[PDB]
Write a protein that binds this ligand. Structure first.
Ligand SMILES: C[C@@H]1O[C@@H](O[C@H]2[C@H](O[C@H]3[C@H](O)[C@@H](O)[C@H](O)O[C@@H]3CO)O[C@H](CO)[C@H](O)[C@@H]2O)[C@@H](O)[C@H](O)[C@@H]1O
Length: 138
């Protein structure tokens, strides 16, 4: 796949589905993001924004964008990615949350703030190369 990536999720999200992303973090990475989007047009709500950042004390930010407004960020001050390194990034869609798994290691559970049933698109962009995106268990 080429970046930016912004594609419909086949059949939408359902509990039990996984999004499996294989990529390589840029040697000079500052950030990248994965968005679960309600729609495809500019201004669309983002049910789940997953945002690793290497600026400062390395961390991953998690949030939701609704009606043009970012909600209260969640943050985990641990960085499972590495500049220049390949990664395997998995989002397991469960009833209560998105379960994030990185390189086989469970990393975070982000509670749903918008209904998973209303997510239509996946958007990926930033300082990485994308090798593949697969939807499993749809
Ligand atoms: C640093 C910021 O990066 C972009 O905006 C992102 C937004 O930044 C938050 C920041 O994470 C938070 O700690 C602070 O309290 O408010 C900032 C402004 O909203 O965070 C959201 C997720 O919460 C997205 O990642 C945004 O891209 C940029 O647009 C800002 O100008 C600023 O440089």
């Amino acid at each position: 796949p080429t970046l930016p990536y912004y594609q419909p999720i086949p059949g939408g999200l359902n509990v039990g589905m996984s999004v499996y992303i294989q990529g390589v973090a840029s040697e000079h990475m500052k950030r990248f993001f994965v968005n679960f989007v309600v729609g495809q047009d500019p201004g669309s709500d983002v049910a789940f924004h997953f945002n690793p950042r290497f600026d400062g004390w390395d961390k991953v930010v998690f949030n939701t964008l609704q009606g043009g407004k970012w909600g209260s960020e969640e943050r985990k001050r641990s960085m499972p990615f590495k500049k220049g390194a390949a990664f395997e990034l998995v989002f397991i869609v469960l009833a209560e949350h998105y379960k994030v798994v990185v390189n086989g290691n469970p990393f975070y559970e982000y509670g749903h703030r918008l209904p998973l049933q209303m997510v239509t698109h996946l958007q990926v962009d930033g300082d990485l190369q994308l090798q593949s995106i697969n939807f499993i268990g749809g």
